[PDB]
Amino acid sequence: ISTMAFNLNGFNFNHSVIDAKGNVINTWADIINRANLGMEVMHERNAHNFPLDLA
Amino acid sequence: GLPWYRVHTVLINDPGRLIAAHLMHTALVAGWAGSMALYELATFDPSDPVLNPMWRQGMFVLPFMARLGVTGSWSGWSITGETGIDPGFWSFEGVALAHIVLSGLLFLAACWHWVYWDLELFRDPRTGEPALDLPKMFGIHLFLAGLLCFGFGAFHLTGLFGPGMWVSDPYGLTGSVQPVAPEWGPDGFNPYNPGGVVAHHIAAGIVGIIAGLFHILVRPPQRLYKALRMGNIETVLSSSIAAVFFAAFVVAGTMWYGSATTPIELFGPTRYQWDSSYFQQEINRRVQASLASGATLEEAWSAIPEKLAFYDYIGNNPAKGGLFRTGPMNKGDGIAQAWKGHAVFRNKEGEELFVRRMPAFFESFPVILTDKNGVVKADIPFRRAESKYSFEQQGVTVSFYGGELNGQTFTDPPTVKSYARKAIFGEIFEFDTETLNSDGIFRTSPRGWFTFAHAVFALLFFFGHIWHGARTLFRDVFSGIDPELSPEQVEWGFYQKVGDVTTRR
Amino acid sequence: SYPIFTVRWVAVHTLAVPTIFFLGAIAAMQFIQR
Amino acid sequence: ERGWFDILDDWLKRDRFVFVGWSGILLFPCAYLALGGWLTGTTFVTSWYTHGLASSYLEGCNFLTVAVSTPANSMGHSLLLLWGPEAQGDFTRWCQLGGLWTFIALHGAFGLIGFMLRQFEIARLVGVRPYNAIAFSAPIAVFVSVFLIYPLGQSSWFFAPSFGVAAIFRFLLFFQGFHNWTLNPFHMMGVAGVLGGALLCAIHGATVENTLFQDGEGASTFRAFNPTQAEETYSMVTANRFWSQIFGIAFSNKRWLHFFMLFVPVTGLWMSAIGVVGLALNLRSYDFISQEIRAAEDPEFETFYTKNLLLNEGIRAWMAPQDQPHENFVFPEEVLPRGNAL
Amino acid sequence: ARRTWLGDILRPLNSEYGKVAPGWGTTPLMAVFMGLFLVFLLIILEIYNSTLILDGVNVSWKA
Amino acid sequence: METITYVFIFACIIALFFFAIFFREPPRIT
Amino acid sequence: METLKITVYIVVTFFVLLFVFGFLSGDPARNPKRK
Amino acid sequence: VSGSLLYGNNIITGAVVPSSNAIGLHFYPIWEAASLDEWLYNGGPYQLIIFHFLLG
Amino acid sequence: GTFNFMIVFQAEHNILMHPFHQLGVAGVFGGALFCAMHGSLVTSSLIRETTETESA
Amino acid sequence: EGGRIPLWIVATVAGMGVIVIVGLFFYGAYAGLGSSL
Amino acid sequence: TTGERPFSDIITSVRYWVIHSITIPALFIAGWLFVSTGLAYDVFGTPRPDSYYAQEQRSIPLVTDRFEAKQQVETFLEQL
Amino acid sequence: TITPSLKGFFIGLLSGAVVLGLTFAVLIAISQIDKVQRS
Amino acid sequence: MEVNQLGLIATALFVLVPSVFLIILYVQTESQQ
Amino acid sequence: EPNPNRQPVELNRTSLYLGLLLILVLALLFSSYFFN
Ligand code: CLA
Ligand code: CLA
Ligand code: CLA
Ligand code: CLA
Ligand SMILES: C=Cc1c(C)c2cc3nc(c4c5[nH]c(cc6nc(cc1[nH]2)C(C)=C6CC)c(C)c5C(=O)[C@@H]4C(=O)OC)[C@@H](CCC(=O)OC/C=C(\C)CCC[C@H](C)CCC[C@H](C)CCCC(C)C)[C@@H]3C
Ligand SMILES: CCCCCCCCCCCCCCCC(=O)OC[C@H](COP(=O)(O)OC[C@@H](O)CO)OC(=O)CCCCCCCCCCCCCCC
Ligand SMILES: CC1=C(/C=C/C(C)=C/C=C/C(C)=C/C=C/C=C(C)/C=C/C=C(C)/C=C/C2=C(C)CCCC2(C)C)C(C)(C)CCC1
Ligand SMILES: CC1=C(/C=C/C(C)=C/C=C/C(C)=C/C=C/C=C(C)/C=C/C=C(C)/C=C/C2=C(C)CCCC2(C)C)C(C)(C)CCC1
Ligand SMILES: CCCCCCCCCCCCO[C@@H]1O[C@H](CO)[C@@H](O[C@H]2O[C@H](CO)[C@@H](O)[C@H](O)[C@H]2O)[C@H](O)[C@H]1O
Ligand code: OEX
Ligand SMILES: [Cl-]
Ligand SMILES: [Mg+2]
């Protein structure tokens, strides 16, 4: 918690696995990502005016 | 003295007081059954088996009475919607009174056995110590159980001397108690074939009679006697608990999946019937056959029974509930009054559009309308600024066929949207939400509650099995290990075979 | 007079053998390119 | 001449490096196959046909992302036996259909049975009371409720946990979004039993280590203990005074202490299993009805409970299309729940 | 201890506490019935599960 | 009613703490 | 508010001085063995 | 955001709510507020609690 | 509120995929496990000092 | 037979083996499959 | 102890290393070749980087039928 | 008739009996050859 | 807040029934010789 | 008269306190769900 406080975060394997053409092959890390996105876009729903949540 | 969690251990050496405690427990359980049936009868509305059946009303014991042939009241009604019936003594009310009277007689017997505990019958004639011959008791009880099981199958379920059991068609529209013949072929092992249940009880009964005679006449092997501690009544508690958790799991599973012994008119529909759109497929079949034989759309939808449409509604799915959302399903969505009819949605071009239905997993669900090939054509947007598919932009309308709203068409976008929000739940009904002050939030049926309580209790009885098994097999070390336990028996190197002093090095 | 075939020896090999095979397979995979 | 049964018993119960016993005949093969099936699947086997995911080192996943994934939803609760009617004896197809999921789950279940039978078997031979077996009923209740009962209540094995590190994380987050499982008091009792157990483990180990008797000259104090010594190695009297003065209460009975250490985390796991039996049926602690009535009528009423529900609504909408591919969900951008900007 | 009419009649049914058949007795036969019961449970499970599918046995409300 | 109930249970727990501490069964070394 | 502030500043100062002076008052010596 | 029992919470939903984002990391004792009413609005109790708790 | 903090933290940091949180889970799951193990092993081996009608 | 190859060397060599194979796996996180590239 | 030779005696002996300096590398190389020859793909039915999708589809070959899932996979594979 | 799944059922049943039969034959044999000394 | 009307009686009996059970047992333990 | 299977029962002070803490804490936990 005390190092994520300074935004050094968990591993990000989002789109890490790619096929011969360059299609993304999802892993269970990508499905976590979808869940995280749902939390992200909904939290503090009237507090963000700009597109990145930088803190 | 004894700690609180061991008080009942005073009964281990006291057969007469054990029997009394058993009689007390039996009196309590039978008094619960009577009390429960009376409460249900005081609250059950019998006026509408179509849209207000028992399983909408939080009825738990009523369906059990019905399953085995008790379907009428002394006040003149039957659960299939008959009037002027004479059930005889064995109405719901007679069954509840019988259980109350039994409870009372069992309570009196408990008193006699508690006071006259020291009967010569419970003493070993050779030692004068209290003693029960548990192997022979087993055979006597198994013989008795086999007889009852056989007779239940041969006389009650067949109708030969008894009423039969509840059976229905595959869509749960015309259920009734009927005599049922045994199925002796392989289809008897199909959970959905009622003749299997009859055959089960005839065959398993005969088997119990035979094994029972076996167990009355042949003593256990010394080897099994010692290993299962057959002189210790606690061994019987252990194995009995195991059998009971097995059986509790089986009744949970057949309640949740459905079988010939868990009909939909008594316990409600299953969650799987929503999953596979079972009722919707049959509805659409009947409508297409109507259409193929000449009918208008109005006529074809108007020929669908309200009862069939009601099964095609997620508010009757048992997987929609909540652990602390208490009471009958009627407390949530309301008391169903009537089918509104089948809603057909169309855009401005007049193409038919289909509301995407809510799966059981989702407490809330968006409103999305597709054409017949699954292409999205309309929706209810969250963000509006980049909306492309709103009902206003696509000119969505709704027309109703069958039911109350038959022949009506709505074009006001808020109204069409309101009906689309109901369409995620399947077919649309009118409900009375006032009589019970319904809150609008879905509850499970007796199928869901039964299933929950039996799965939980079965899991907890696993711990009981392990606990009492352990106590049985480790009785000698219940208060601790031998104070002068040999260090050689537990150290390594000394005995060649673990725990055998005769294998010393 | 220490024996070689023992239950322990068998137990060790049921794990050690596949483990080394698998580690070779996974080492190879590190050179696979899409 | 003694009988063959008794001769086999001797041999099964020989004191060896790895005890075997009669329990060993169930335990060893089921444990070995569960573990080998997991190592095989995570190393070599895909989930493309069941989930549309890569799941093995072969495909490029790492230790965090590999898994043996559940079968497709259309499999229902099929046993999915190698020789069953889905795979029909074809090993390759079996793998592609998720047959290793049921293989690992069922051999793992029989192996846990064998492990607890081992605990009873060894306890009996050495002459101790079988509390360790009894404590192990908790891990069993958890495995059975979560890997078996939960999916049996749901549509299919698909919604069981898949055997993998990231896959399990997904299972956590699904439970928050769909079941609001953090709100469930049976989960809450589980948390108290696990964190309370970890608290007891730390506090008890630390207390004994800081009330030790000086029984040696070493500054490193581990050598000053002998297993066969009759005497307590640490002072219960001093430990008791310390905690009585620091916290207000203290243990004074060592038998009660050690029993309580069994009781707390075993009871907690058992409570958590009961909650998951409820979730098998979607019988959730999802809502507080009174909160909903107020919030619906009063648009200025907000609590942390209503906030968390907005998060759950986000999780379900954003995850369901990829997490539930058999549903063929298409959620146009315009229907997705989002706050401002993000 | 107290004698009663019904206790006197039942007395022989609670008179063989501790009585065993020699050695292994009917154990092997018990084992065969256990084995058979196991196969029976496996059959009725596999039928319900649709892993064992039999002619004329449609595991659905439509039979 | 609900607030009174939650506060009442809490208050009982705080009282229990006081008795469990100051009116404990004294640890006796003999 | 100004009075609340002063009161709390005095209270805090008092306990802090107890802590500092208390620990300066022969603390190593307050143990059951070598002093 | 309502945190307290008397303002519509139960034991599971209730909380002492963190101090306002407008404050940030600024020290917000009682004597920084123009009134107890302001102090309550802006989440003053959270800071008093957590600072005394971490110290204690 | 604690659950709210947890869910947002997962959104913003992917805590579940952070090895220190993973060490935390091994710490508490393992503390619970060894808690039950130790309790059960010591309890298994209590010296007989009491009769069947008394708590050990 | 015996104690010819000292245990400290066995330990050191086997430990270095483990480091090499694990190091190789970390290399692979950045090249080929799973590299995101 | 239980009678088996100490591990420390075994793994510091020359005989152990004569045997295992052959068996260990051999097994490693065999596992390597299991992957390098492509055989692993075909035993387990795992797609190669070029076989997740046909050239112009972006539809996953999800199995949708319990009893002819075997054939659905067969057909999904013929259509690459 | 014998459906393909009933034939599969028999195959699973035979396979299981073989694994068990072989496991017990081998352990019985080993136990007979490799006896515990009671001296 | 529109709470369930049985919540009060349920909570009250949940506390009182087992609590009084324990009190009964405690007091009659103290009154033993 | 005289049943020889009778035994006194006990609950010591500490057990009372532990049991009351369990009950009260369960009540504090479950009450919110009972009021709903
Ligand atoms: C298996 C038993 C069972 C089942 C399945 C049902 C099912 C049903 N009953 Mg019946 N009922 C039962 C037993 C049962 N009842 C008993 C024994 C009684 C006498 C009390 C009743 C009296 C009764 C009444 C008076 C009513 C019903 C009604 C109903 C319906 C709604 C149920 C509901 O809302 O539950 C809600 C369930 C819960 C809120 C879950 C409770 C979980 C508890 C609190 C857990 C406690 C945990 C514990 C403290 C932790 C220990 C921890 C420790 C070890 C550390 C439903 C059909 C209602 C109705 O619709 O009837 C027409 C109705 O009015 N029932
Ligand atoms: C047929 C089922 C059955 C029977 C007859 C027994 C009988 C017994 N048990 Mg076992 N037990 C069982 C199932 C059973 N148990 C199950 C399912 C579990 C796991 C939950 C256990 C776990 C267990 C443990 C852990 C222990 C026993 C012990 C005992 C003995 C003393 C019990 C006593 O004095 O309690 C006195 C109980 C009270 C004064 C109050 C209990 C109140 C409970 C906790 C809540 C309210 C209960 C409510 C009325 C239940 C309704 C019924 C329910 C099924 C719906 C006694 C031989 C004890 C023993 O071995 O002593 C040597 C012991 O330590 N049992
Ligand atoms: C104790 C060891 C043990 C146990 C308990 C299991 C248990 C299981 N195995 Mg595993 N297995 C084992 C060891 C074990 N296995 C070993 C050593 C191997 C390597 C050979 C395997 C390889 C394996 C595979 C490859 C698979 C399983 C599967 C299974 C499952 C179904 C088994 C089945 O239906 O058998 C049915 C058989 C029996 C129950 C034996 C009954 C014998 C009775 C008592 C006598 C009847 C004999 C009869 C008269 C013979 C004549 C028949 C005639 C009519 C033709 C189950 C979880 C399947 C599974 O996991 O699918 C997901 C699966 O595909 N096992
Ligand atoms: C403070 C935070 C916290 C804490 C302490 C807990 C604690 C718990 N959680 Mg909760 N959880 C949390 C937050 C938390 N959770 C949050 C915020 C969420 C989001 C909703 C969840 C979602 C969640 C879910 C979805 C589940 C839990 C479950 C649990 C229980 C897991 C018990 C266990 O050890 O299972 C571990 C597994 C077992 C004990 C099974 C047996 C395992 C055998 C013995 C393993 C043998 C391994 C073998 C030797 C091979 C190893 C090989 C090696 C290579 C890997 C436990 C009570 C579970 C539960 O309730 O279970 C009933 C569960 O399903 N939680
Ligand atoms: C994630 C949590 C967790 C793990 C991994 C775990 C693991 C373990 N617990 C054991 C014991 C115990 N656990 C206990 C209480 C607890 N255990 C807890 C939580 C866990 N316990 C908790 C919270 C408690 C408190 C109640 C007790 C009291 C014991 C023991 O006595 C025993 C022991 O000896 O510990 C030292 C050992 C059982 C050995 C065994 O069965 O071998 C045989 C292996 C078998 C039968 C195979 C199991 C296969 C599993 C079920 C399914 C497949 C698993 C895959 C191989 C791996 C998938 C990995 C992904 C999910 C990432 C093992 C080390
Ligand atoms: C971070 C963890 C901290 C650990 C704390 C320290 C104490 C606990 C030790 C942890 C584990 C390491 C072991 C001690 C390490 C130690 O002290 O070394 C000493 C020990 C024995 O070495 P020796 O050379 O003296 O060999 C003597 C014996 O082999 C008998 O002659 O080595 C082993 O045990 C080898 C382990 C591999 C054996 C694997 C065989 C396969 C067995 C399968 C298991 C099944 C059992 C479960 C039933 C299903
Ligand atoms: C004596 C007599 C009589 C009478 C009788 C009577 C009147 C009876 C009654 C009875 C009754 C009237 C009974 C009742 C019972 C009940 C019960 C027994 C109950 C129980 C319950 C329970 C156990 C519960 C539980 C729970 C809860 C509470 C919560 C939820 C969960 C549960 C479910 C767990 C006569 C005249 C005949 C004559 C002879 C004599
Ligand atoms: C499934 C199946 C089966 C079986 C198989 C088997 C039994 C297998 C096994 C397998 C195995 C048995 C494998 C193994 C592998 C292993 C591995 C892969 C390992 C790795 C490792 C590592 C990588 C390490 C790391 C680490 C750690 C852990 C800690 C310390 C540090 C370090 C980092 C070093 C059969 C045929 C019957 C049938 C069908 C199906
Ligand atoms: C030793 C400490 C014990 C503390 C006990 C304190 C009780 C004595 C003070 C009573 C003050 C509470 O006064 C409170 O005021 C506001 C008016 O603006 C009310 O207004 C409130 O109504 C509802 C009540 O469910 C709330 O959900 C809502 O968030 C709020 O608008 C509260 O309902 C009322 O109860
Ligand atoms: O505040 Mn509480 O949560 Ca940390 O990120 Mn930015 O800010 Mn708000 O959004 Mn996301
Ligand atoms: Cl938020
Ligand atoms: Mg790579």
Pairing verdict, β B2-3 and N9-10:
parallel
Max intra-chain CA distance, chain L: 61
Among D73, D154, B253, CA closest to E48: B253
* CATH number of the domain residue K78 falls in: 1.20.5.860
Residue type, A1: I
Q: By the 8 A CB rule, do D74 and K69 touch? A: yes
Which residues of A belong to the annotated binding site for [CaMn4O5] cluster? 43-44, 53, 55
Q: How was this structure determined?
A: X-ray
Among B384, F13, K77, CA closest to D333: B384
Length of chain C: 34
Q: By the 8 A CB rule, do D70 and D159 touch? A: yes
User: CA Rg, chain A, in Å?
Assistant: 14
Q: By the 8 A CB rule, do C33 and J37 touch? A: no
3-state SS, chain F, equals CHHHHHHHHHHHHHHHHHHHHHCCCCCCCC
Q: What DSSP element (H or E) covers B352? A: strand B352-355
Residues of M in contact with B1 (CB under 8 A): 29, 32
Strand partners, D284: B322
* Whole-angstrom distance, CA of residue D250 vs CA of residue D263: 17
Tell me the three state secondary structure of residue B326. Answer: coil
* Whole-angstrom distance, CA of residue H25 vs CA of residue J34: 41
* Whole-angstrom distance, CA of residue D178 vs CA of residue D183: 12
Among B403, B256, B433, B386, CA closest to B343: B403
Q: Which atom of ligand 8 is nearest to the CA of C14?
A: 12
Q: By the 8 A CB rule, do B353 and B369 touch? A: yes
* Whole-angstrom distance, CA of residue E46 vs CA of residue N9: 51
Nearest protein CA to atom 6 of ligand 8, as residue:
D36
Length of chain M: 33
* Whole-angstrom distance, CA of residue K77 vs CA of residue K42: 12
Q: Is A53 in the pocket of ligand 10 (CB under 6 A)?
A: yes
* Whole-angstrom distance, CA of residue I6 vs CA of residue F13: 28
Q: By the 8 A CB rule, do B419 and B399 touch? A: no
Distance from A1 to chain D by nearest Cα, in Å? 17
* Whole-angstrom distance, CA of residue I27 vs CA of residue D140: 20
Q: Is the dihedral of CA B439, B444, B450, B454 positive or negative?
A: negative
* Whole-angstrom distance, CA of residue B146 vs CA of residue B151: 8
Q: Is D168 in the pocket of ligand 5 (CB under 6 A)?
A: yes
DSSP structure class, residue B90: -
Q: Report how far Cα L11 is from the mean position of its chain's Cα atoms.
A: 14
Return left, alpha or beta for J36; rule: phi > 0 is left, psi -120 to 50 is alpha, else beta: left
Q: How many CA atoms within 13 Å lie on the side-chain side of B470?
A: 26
CB atoms closer than 10 angstroms to residue D173: 22
| Chain J contacts to A (CB-CB under 8 A) | 33-37
Beta-strand ranges (E) seen in D5-111 are 67-68
Among B145, B182, B176, CA closest to B163: B176
D49 Cβ contact list (under 8 Å, min separation 6):
D72, D96, D97, K61, K62, K63, K73, K76
Domain boundaries in chain D?
1-342
Domain hosting residue K38, numbered range: 1-80
Q: What are phi and psi of B191, to 5 degrees?
A: -60, -20
Right CATH number for E1-51 from 1.10.760.10, 1.20.5.880, 1.10.490.10, 3.40.228.10?
A: 1.20.5.880
Q: What's the Cα-to-Cα distance from K32 to each of B159, D56, K40, rounded to whole Å?
A: 71, 16, 10
Alpha helices in B44-170 (DSSP H): 62-67, 92-115, 134-151
CATH topology assigned to domain J1-37: 6.10.250
B229 Cβ contact list (under 8 Å, min separation 6):
B235, B472, B473, B475
Q: What's the Cα-to-Cα distance from F15 to each of B377, F9, F12, N19, rounded to whole Å?
A: 64, 10, 5, 14
Residue holding tokens 């302001």?
A: H38
Among A1, A35, A31, CA closest to A16: A31
Task: Report residue B257 as tokens.
Answer: 């999946």
Task: Report residue K9 as tokens.
Answer: 């005696």
DSSP structure class, residue D21: T
CA of residue D304 to ligand 10 center, whole Å: 15
Cα dihedral A23/A25/A26/A30 (nearest 10): -50
* Whole-angstrom distance, CA of residue B274 vs CA of residue B276: 6
Q: What's the Cα-to-Cα distance from K56 to each of A15, B264, B375, C20, K53, rounded to whole Å?
A: 20, 48, 20, 40, 8
DSSP D165-198: HHHHHHHHHHIIIII-GGG-HHHHHHHHHHHHHH
* Whole-angstrom distance, CA of residue K50 vs CA of residue K80: 9
Nearest to B4 among M4, M25, M32 (CB): M25
Q: By the 8 A CB rule, do B315 and B425 touch? A: yes
Q: What are phi and psi of D215, to 5 degrees?
A: -115, 20
DSSP structure class, residue H19: P
Q: What are phi and psi of E19, to 5 degrees?
A: -70, 125
What total number of domains does chain K contain?
A: 1
Q: What are phi and psi of L21, to 5 degrees?
A: -50, -50
* Whole-angstrom distance, CA of residue I16 vs CA of residue B366: 29
Length of chain N: 36
Among D189, D157, D164, CA closest to D75: D157
Q: Where chain D is broken, by preceding residue (C–N > 2.5 Å)?
A: none
Among D195, D160, D277, CA closest to I2: D195
Task: Report residue A35 as tokens.
Answer: 């869940």
I10: burial class by Cβ within 10 Å (0-12, 13-18, 19+)? buried
DSSP structure class, residue D334: G
B173 Cβ contact list (under 8 Å, min separation 6):
B305, B307, B308
Q: By the 8 A CB rule, do B28 and B99 touch? A: no
* L8 contacts D84? CB cut-off 8 A: yes
* L15 contacts D11? CB cut-off 8 A: no
* Whole-angstrom distance, CA of residue B12 vs CA of residue B2: 14
Q: By the 8 A CB rule, do B132 and B230 touch? A: no
Q: What's the Cα-to-Cα distance from D143 to each of D35, D120, D147, rounded to whole Å?
A: 15, 19, 6
* Whole-angstrom distance, CA of residue B132 vs CA of residue E14: 6
Among B227, B53, B48, B218, CA closest to B139: B218
Q: Is I52 in the pocket of ligand 10 (CB under 6 A)?
A: no
Tell me the three state secondary structure of residue B16. Answer: helix
Probe residue for ligand 5, chosen from D69, D112, D148 as the CB with the greatest number of ligand atoms within 8 Å: D112
* H3 contacts D183? CB cut-off 8 A: no
Alpha helices in D50-98 (DSSP H): 91-96
Residue type, H13: T
Strand partners, B370: B354, B376
Among M14, B248, I38, CA closest to D202: I38
Give CA angle at D230 (D224, D234), nearest 5°.
50
Query: Which pairs from N16-22 meet CB under 8 Å and 24+ separation?
Result: N16/M22, N16/M23, N16/M25, N16/M26, N17/F16, N17/F19, N17/F20, N17/F24, N19/M18, N19/M19, N19/M22, N20/F16, N20/M19, N20/M22, N21/F13, N21/F16, N21/F20
* Whole-angstrom distance, CA of residue B403 vs CA of residue D79: 44
Length of chain B: 505
* D89 contacts L5? CB cut-off 8 A: no
Tell me the three state secondary structure of residue B346. Answer: strand
Q: By the 8 A CB rule, do B89 and B58 touch? A: no
Residue holding tokens 């929950």?
A: B452
Q: By the 8 A CB rule, do I23 and D192 touch? A: no
Q: Is the dihedral of CA D186, D191, D196, D202 positive or negative?
A: positive
* Whole-angstrom distance, CA of residue B344 vs CA of residue G28: 88
K58: burial class by Cβ within 10 Å (0-12, 13-18, 19+)? exposed
Domain boundaries in chain J?
1-37
K78 Cβ contact list (under 8 Å, min separation 6):
none
CB atoms closer than 10 angstroms to residue B270: 24
Q: By the 8 A CB rule, do D52 and A26 touch? A: yes
* Whole-angstrom distance, CA of residue H9 vs CA of residue D288: 10
CB atoms closer than 10 angstroms to residue B384: 8
